[PDB]
Design an enzyme around this catalytic site. Sequence first.
Site, PDB file in Angstrom:
ATOM      1  N   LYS A  22       0.827  -1.206   0.000  1.00 18.87           N
ATOM      2  CA  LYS A  22       0.000   0.000   0.000  1.00 18.87           C
ATOM      3  C   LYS A  22       0.861   1.256   0.000  1.00 18.87           C
ATOM      4  CE  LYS A  22      -2.480   0.630   3.712  1.00 18.87           C
ATOM      5  NZ  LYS A  22      -1.765   1.768   4.373  1.00 18.87           N
ATOM      6  N   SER A  23       1.867   1.279   0.870  1.00 22.06           N
ATOM      7  CA  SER A  23       2.743   2.438   1.021  1.00 22.06           C
ATOM      8  C   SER A  23       3.593   2.725  -0.219  1.00 22.06           C
ATOM      9  CB  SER A  23       3.657   2.264   2.245  1.00 22.06           C
ATOM     10  OG  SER A  23       2.912   2.297   3.451  1.00 22.06           O
ATOM     11  N   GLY A  96      -4.946   8.060   5.261  1.00 21.95           N
ATOM     12  CA  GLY A  96      -4.033   8.991   5.905  1.00 21.95           C
ATOM     13  C   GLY A  96      -2.801   9.250   5.056  1.00 21.95           C
ATOM     14  N   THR A  97      -2.252   8.193   4.468  1.00 22.46           N
ATOM     15  CA  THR A  97      -1.059   8.317   3.647  1.00 22.46           C
ATOM     16  C   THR A  97      -1.286   9.266   2.470  1.00 22.46           C
ATOM     17  OG1 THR A  97      -0.287   6.080   4.180  1.00 22.46           O
ATOM     18  CG2 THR A  97       0.673   7.139   2.228  1.00 22.46           C
ATOM     19  N   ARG A 124      -7.603  12.162  11.933  1.00 20.75           N
ATOM     20  CA  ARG A 124      -6.179  11.833  11.941  1.00 20.75           C
ATOM     21  C   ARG A 124      -5.366  13.111  12.120  1.00 20.75           C
ATOM     22  NH1 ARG A 124      -5.715   6.843   8.792  1.00 20.75           N
ATOM     23  NH2 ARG A 124      -3.494   6.878   9.383  1.00 20.75           N
ATOM     24  N   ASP A 315       2.227  -1.096  12.515  1.00 15.04           N
ATOM     25  CA  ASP A 315       0.990  -1.475  11.839  1.00 15.04           C
ATOM     26  C   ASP A 315       0.592  -2.938  12.015  1.00 15.04           C
ATOM     27  OD1 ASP A 315       0.577   1.128  11.085  1.00 15.04           O
ATOM     28  OD2 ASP A 315       1.349   0.850   9.027  1.00 15.04           O
ATOM     29  N   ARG A 346      -6.524   1.942  18.023  1.00 14.92           N
ATOM     30  CA  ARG A 346      -6.293   0.496  17.857  1.00 14.92           C
ATOM     31  C   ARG A 346      -6.040  -0.239  19.153  1.00 14.92           C
ATOM     32  NH1 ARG A 346      -2.939   0.365  11.998  1.00 14.92           N
ATOM     33  NH2 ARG A 346      -4.875   0.317  10.765  1.00 14.92           N
ATOM     34  N   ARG A 387      -7.403  -3.266   9.720  1.00 11.19           N
ATOM     35  CA  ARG A 387      -6.504  -4.174  10.430  1.00 11.19           C
ATOM     36  C   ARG A 387      -7.129  -4.802  11.665  1.00 11.19           C
ATOM     37  NH1 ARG A 387      -2.272  -3.997   7.267  1.00 11.19           N
ATOM     38  NH2 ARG A 387      -1.559  -1.954   6.486  1.00 11.19           N
TER      39      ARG A 387
END
Length: 436
Positions: A22-23, A96-97, A124, A315, A346, A387
């Site tokens: 993803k990143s 968020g990224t 966020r 993560d 989380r 997640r």
Amino acid sequence: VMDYQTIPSQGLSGEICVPGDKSISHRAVLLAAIAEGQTQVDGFLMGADNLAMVSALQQMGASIQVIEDENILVVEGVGMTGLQAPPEALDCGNSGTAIRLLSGLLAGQPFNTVLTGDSSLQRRPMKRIIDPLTLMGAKIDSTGNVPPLKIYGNPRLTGIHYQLPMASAQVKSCLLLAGLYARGKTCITEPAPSRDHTERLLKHFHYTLQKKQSICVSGGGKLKANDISIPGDISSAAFFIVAATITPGSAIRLCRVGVNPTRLGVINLLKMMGADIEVTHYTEKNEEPTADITVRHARLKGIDIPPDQVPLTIDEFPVLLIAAAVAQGKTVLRDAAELRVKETDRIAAMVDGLQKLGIAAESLPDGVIIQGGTLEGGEVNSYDDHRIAMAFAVAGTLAKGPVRIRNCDNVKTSFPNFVELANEVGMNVKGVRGRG
Ligand SMILES: [K+]
């Protein structure tokens, strides 16, 4: 609305390739969009977050062909100054990224942009990026340091020397992007090293980087198109690694997974707990190391998680806490307050769900105390966090009874084919109609 329903597993087996990172996918398409020339991107993660990044770039006149069924993007770069002012707020969805990277990209453009997203994204924290970008001469309106953000582009940004007081949460990447458009050099120095996906991609696209505990870029360079192959997401693999570890009778191989050292925390920690994990067929295709990961059932012991592994595993803590729940003895997680400011809190989410499944779990401001025990069947909430949802799907493999995970529509933000792959290796998960 839909939920996941599980039944216990009689053992995982087989070989599967998890979808792309993803990143790396976010950074790959963003850099390709402003490069000169044509970039073919293989292994692009066709999840909701990464496709939100694609749509956002397209609103500004990036030229991106999406070939969803093959996980391919073909990008005709528009060059450094080629973007155009978008007509509406850019919807980053759950990502968020995307919002933090776009902020860096857009701070130095000759136009204004509004960035927003879903309810979760609007909680966020952004202070971490607003402040340094402002030091470079950016102007960003926001209330309470959360999205929505209004960026008033400043084409005359200035390079700063910034020392982030925290292992960056995309802060380094954000400032590096802004650095490309700033006059002079921008230098970021960090306490502990963090993910370096951006640096590897900048190098890939032939942007000069330097180089000791800090990293610097000078602005005004050009990105040059260069085909990229994206490795499997180890954060996605982590769910299967834990599943095969805790489910008796299991032996699986995960092929073509990214094994970037800054991402290997879940493996490091599981091994400390007694896991049986072997990394082979290690190769170096462009920029990012990848390998095959073989996992076999193993009995675990609880550990005090070393503070230096926290950034490497941040993560993967949701699924790692499932391993702790079924280990022998106590596990203690500290220094992980960043877990509270993710898609959901989380720590609160995992503690809530674990207690619902019969595990003695206790919150700390910066972590959790877990006493290893026995997972029961039951029902938990994902809190709309991909997640958390997948962590409890993994819990279902060993739980004594069925586990119902409410609200799993967001799993596709990072792992679109999760259910298919889970059932393929023998992890029983079904999508069923939920409530509300
Ligand atoms: K997300």
